[PDB]
Structure 1
Amino acid sequence: AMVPNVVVTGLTLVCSSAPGPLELDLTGDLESFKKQSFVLKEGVEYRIKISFRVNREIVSGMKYIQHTYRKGVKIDKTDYMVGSYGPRAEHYHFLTPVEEAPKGMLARGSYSIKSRFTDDDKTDHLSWEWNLTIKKDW
């Protein structure tokens, strides 16, 4: 502290066809997000972008872990290998592979997401929670 080795600064849902920006500022109050949601139209392609800075030492085997819940029930768990990164002032941007929102009336509604950014030391660089709502339309 005040700026430790990794500072996770943002999550962005990158989607060509979304009408507005879908962004969380992860330097802020993380409790706030629990009360908000991103809307995705069903079936659309998107990527999750995590923005972060490294301050002092090279970090290796960075990993972004995402758990998805529906009705409080764990339904998906994905780990994404992020890579190795040296210290610098400029943000790094990690992007997942393209994902697809689920589709169909039965898949519509809100889901809760538990995210963690970690590494090969299993350091908790940041853990946060957010919500995704799948709709017939934007």
Structure 2
Amino acid sequence: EPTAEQLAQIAAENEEDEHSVNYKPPAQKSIQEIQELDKDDESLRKYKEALLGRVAVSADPNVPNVVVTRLTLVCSTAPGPLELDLTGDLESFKKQSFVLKEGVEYRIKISFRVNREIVSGMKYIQHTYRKGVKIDKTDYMVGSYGPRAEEYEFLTPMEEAPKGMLARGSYNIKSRFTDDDRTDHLSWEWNLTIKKEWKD
């Protein structure tokens, strides 16, 4: 017997880990505005230059500020590559069989690209569902970034995979990339499956 409705008991995490004096999002200023705030201060210009770099801004119409390219599963034990082309068709992910061997330590490689402005405190929210029940809430802060031609590649901390002796089923995963401005850059769903062996 794999699973029952003891999924609600698994919520021995959920929400109660908030208890913190809230941050407070920063005003919605902009690069050009930042650039003109203290032109008089040589020290501050050097400061903005190190953080903001210099020039190179392409497509303004079609292209949004943030554009996630992919999500890669970095694992030394995984024989076959695990990626998700977060470009174009996303419905395809609603019928894939993503296997992930139990108990293995792993990490996520987020690959995005900032185009025009600053992305303040961008985060990756992941919701894990089993039989329609949300049994896990997870937030991976990526941080604030500036616009540039070359793509960024963020890695999440090393985490362990669950032991299949019980919960070795298939999950519905809902994910989205938002930020301090509540802007929803992307949102999609996909299915993952735990097993006892790699590609069994």
TM-score under structure 1 length normalisation:
0.94
The answer to which of 91-100 and 118-127 deviates more is 91-100
Percent identity over the alignment?
94
Pair 1:43-2:103 in alignment: yes
Q: Deviations along 1:95-123, whole A, 9 cap, x unmatched?
A: 11111110032111211111111110010
Q: Which has the larger radius of gyration?
A: 2
Shift of 1:48: 1.5
Unaligned runs of 5+ in 2: 1-62
Give the number of aligned pairs.
136
What secondary structure does 2:87 align onto?
Answer: coil
Q: Greater helix share, 1 or 2?
A: 2
- SS of equivalent to 1:33: helix
Find 1:124's aligned residue among 165, 184, 191: 184
CA distance in 2, matches of 1:77, 1:124: 17
Counterparts of 1:134 and 1:91, CA distance in 2 = 31
Q: CA deviation at 1:93?
A: 1.2
Structure 1 residue 79: deviation in Å?
A: 1.0
Contact 1:112 1:130 survives alignment (8 Å)? yes
Residue range with higher mean Cα deviation, 95-104 or 71-80: 95-104
Contact 2:104/2:160 (8 A) holds in 1: yes
Secondary structure in 2 matching 1:105: coil
The residue aligned with 1:13 is 73
**What SS does the aligned partner of 1:7 have?**
coil
State TM-score, norm by structure 2: 0.66
Rounded to whole Å, the distance in 1 between the matches of 2:127 and 2:164 is 21
User: In the TM superposition, what is the alpha-carbon distance from 1:18 to its structure 2 partner?
Assistant: 0.5
How far did residue 7 of structure 1 move? Answer: 0.4
The root-mean-square deviation of aligned C-alpha atoms, in Å, is 1.0
Segments of 4+ in structure 1 off by > 6 A?
none
More strand by share: 1
Q: Secondary structure at the match of 1:60?
A: strand
Instruction: For residue 78 of structure 1, give the secondary structure of its aligned residue in structure 2.
Output: strand
Q: Which of 131, 134, 140 is the equivalent residue of 1:80?
A: 140
- Contact 1:37-1:130 within 8 A present in 2 as well: no
Q: Which has the higher contact order (CA 8 A, sep 6+)?
A: 1
